[PDB]
Design a protein around this ligand. Structure first.
Ligand SMILES: Nc1ncnc2c1ncn2[C@@H]1O[C@H](CSCC[C@H](N)C(=O)O)[C@@H](O)[C@H]1O
Lengths: 130, 41, 425
């Protein structure tokens, strides 16, 4: 499609990153997302799907890399994604990433309710320091 | 709103003789001396 | 190229407002930066006096002190800030004898009439710049002639329901036995209808922090209601709590050209029927207008979204300008089609163009029926308005509402047409 010389459709671009997320290829997924920004598209909506796919395929560590990098950019994730991403990290004992994600959510305009703090406490209660 | 947590514990307590030796690791002192009067050593 | 050689010396419907309009506010610590108030046959409006070069953050446009506003809590108890009602005044009993959730407009109307009676209140001066009973576009003032022409049984029933509620409230609280201080507020039933119309069409609910207290207030901010409505506003309302100043701020990083109108969104997302019920106006570019549709036929909205450069989640549907290049067709009207049209979508399942082509005409086969349901056409109504020269403004709005709805049906007919052929490429 690039060799022919026309701009790929966003649906094609969205399908590409979703396929990469299904196989957990983080490097391929981020490279395609960079192309969309270079193609001047809405990277945020595709960025949500890639993060969800990595969580769906249990590639949580790679999902943290993708989610945080988008989080530092300034784009705001959906409410479900914040709840999903934080809960998975706390279930996996990833409070370091969960707390960092929670801080990004606070800067994104959403405040941590009781649910988000409960996830964090599930890990802090096992650190041995009350 | 998540407070920027900063936990800094500052404990004090009696020190075991082993940890006293750990401070001097060998730092045994036996001569009750100081700078020499003439050589200033 | 010298200034002496250069000899510099449209929009006739808009004239500069009375200088006293800004002056009476300017003396009360009201500052408008880079904007000016213009008035016309439609009404007032704020238009930029110069090009607003975008900055890192939002730019201050207007400032309104708290003492110039009329504010009442949305939730019981009813406490008025910049307190104007004296303790023991009989007008509080009228206000306190209202529905806690349905009579928000009535409680503001009582304060609005009370403020006009007060000699020291600022709104007794600002009330002269409010539209009269005939000039106001609220449907609450419309009669059956305009309501019948509105051609909306649901909307007409709601409007006539409100008229009974407002009129009966005046009858109960403005009988012959009221004190003169209450009777003079509403000498006739008609004036109270106008008071409620102003309250409905100019209330601005907002969560404001006054001192240490945070609450929701049905506010009556002056000079800020004059901002017109647009679902893609160029400015928003921000409450500054330290000095009790309501700031009108243009969106950050957005340039405003000379003469461009400053607009805010009265409601986040609503249909034209809601706007007519509340504010008595409609917009053909509403991205929230719906239309009943059979669920048998549906299309792939992802293809529909992309062909018009619409991106984001349905809660944040928007169009990209530079990607489309010019695309004069796409507007906020077609965005509503992306929601109200029956659609289907899988993970990545591509659609069948022939099946959609089999359905696009079938979809458009239904679309011609609703236009046939209304006896008049979209161009017939607007042609009538140009020919019309003596009628109530609510009649024009009722014409506009059905015209906008008909165009909304007309817009999607063209939208499906261009979508169908563009699907091949
Ligand atoms: N975007 C818009 N399109 C058409 N009429 C609008 C509008 N925004 C506001 N109005 C008009 O203004 C009323 C709300 S109060 C806004 C003040 C008014 N524009 C004035 O000139 O004094 C509506 O009932 C409608 O009559």
């Amino acid at each position: 499609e690039l060799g022919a010389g026309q701009r790929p459709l966003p649906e094609t671009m969205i399908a590409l990153v979703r396929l990469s997320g299904s196989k957990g290829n983080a490097q391929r997924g981020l490279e395609l997302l960079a192309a969309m920004e270079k193609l001047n598209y809405d990277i945020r909506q595709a960025w949500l799907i890639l993060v969800e796919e990595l969580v769906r395929t249990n590639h949580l560590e790679e999902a943290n890399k993708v989610f945080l990098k988008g989080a530092r950019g300034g784009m705001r994730a959906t409410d479900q994604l914040y709840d999903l991403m934080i809960e998975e990290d706390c279930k996996a004992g990833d409070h370091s990433n969960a707390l960092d994600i929670s801080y990004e959510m606070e800067a994104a305009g959403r405040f941590a309710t009781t649910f988000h703090f409960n996830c964090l406490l599930s890990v802090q209660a096992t650190c041995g320091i009350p | 709103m998540i407070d920027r947590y900063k936990h800094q514990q500052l404990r004090i307590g009696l020190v075991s003789p082993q940890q006293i030796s750990a401070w001097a690791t060998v730092g045994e002192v036996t001569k009750p001396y100081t700078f020499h009067y003439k050589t200033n050593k | 190229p010298f200034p002496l050689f250069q000899s510099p010396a449209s929009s006739s419907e808009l004239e500069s407002a009375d200088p006293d309009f800004y002056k009476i506010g300017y003396v009360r610590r009201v500052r408008a930066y880079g904007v000016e108030f213009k008035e016309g046959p439609d009404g007032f409006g704020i238009y930029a006096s110069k090009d607003i070069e975008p900055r890192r953050r939002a730019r201050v446009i207007m400032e309104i002190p708290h003492e110039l506003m009329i504010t009442i809590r949305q939730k019981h108890p009813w406490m008025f800030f910049p307190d104007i009602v004296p303790i023991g005044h009989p007008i509080f009993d009228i206000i306190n004898s209202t529905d806690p959730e349905r009579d928000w407009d009535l409680r503001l109307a009582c304060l609005l009439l009370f403020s006009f009676d007060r000699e020291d209140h600022f709104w007794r001066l600002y009330g002269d710049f409010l539209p009269a009973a005939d000039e106001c576009s609220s449907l609450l003032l419309a009669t059956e002639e305009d309501l019948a022409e509105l051609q909306d049984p649901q909307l007409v029933s709601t409007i006539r329901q409100q008229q009974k509620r407002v009129l009966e409230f005046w009858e109960k609280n403005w009988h012959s036995g009221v004190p003169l201080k209450i009777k003079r507020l509403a000498e006739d039933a008609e004036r109270f209808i106008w008071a409620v119309s102003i309250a409905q069409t100019r209330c601005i609910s907002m969560k404001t922090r006054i001192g240490a207290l945070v609450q929701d207030l049905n506010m009556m901010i002056p000079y800020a209601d004059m901002l017109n409505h647009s679902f893609e506003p160029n400015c928003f309302l921000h409450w500054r709590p330290k000095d009790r100043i309501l700031e009108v701020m243009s969106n950050a990083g957005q340039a405003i050209k000379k003469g461009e109108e400053m607009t805010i969104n009265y409601m986040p997302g609503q249909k034209n029927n809601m706007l007519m019920e509340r504010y008595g106006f409609s917009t053909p570019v509403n991205p929230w207008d719906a239309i009943p549709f059979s669920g048998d036929s549906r299309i792939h909205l992802n293809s529909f979204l992309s062909v018009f450069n619409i991106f984001g989640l349905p809660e944040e549907y928007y169009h990209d300008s530079e990607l489309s290049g010019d695309d004069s067709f796409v507007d906020g009207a077609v965005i509503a089609a992306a929601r109200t049209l029956p659609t289907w979508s899988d993970i990545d399942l591509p659609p069948i163009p022939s099946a959609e082509r089999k359905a696009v005409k079938e979809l458009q086969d239904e679309c011609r029926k609703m236009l046939a349901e209304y006896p008049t056409t979209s161009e017939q109504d607007q042609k009538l308005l140009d020919s019309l020269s003596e009628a109530r403004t609510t009649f024009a709005t009722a014409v506009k509402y059905r015209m906008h709805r008909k165009m909304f049906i007309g817009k999607i007919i063209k939208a499906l047409d261009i979508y169908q052929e563009r699907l091949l490429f």
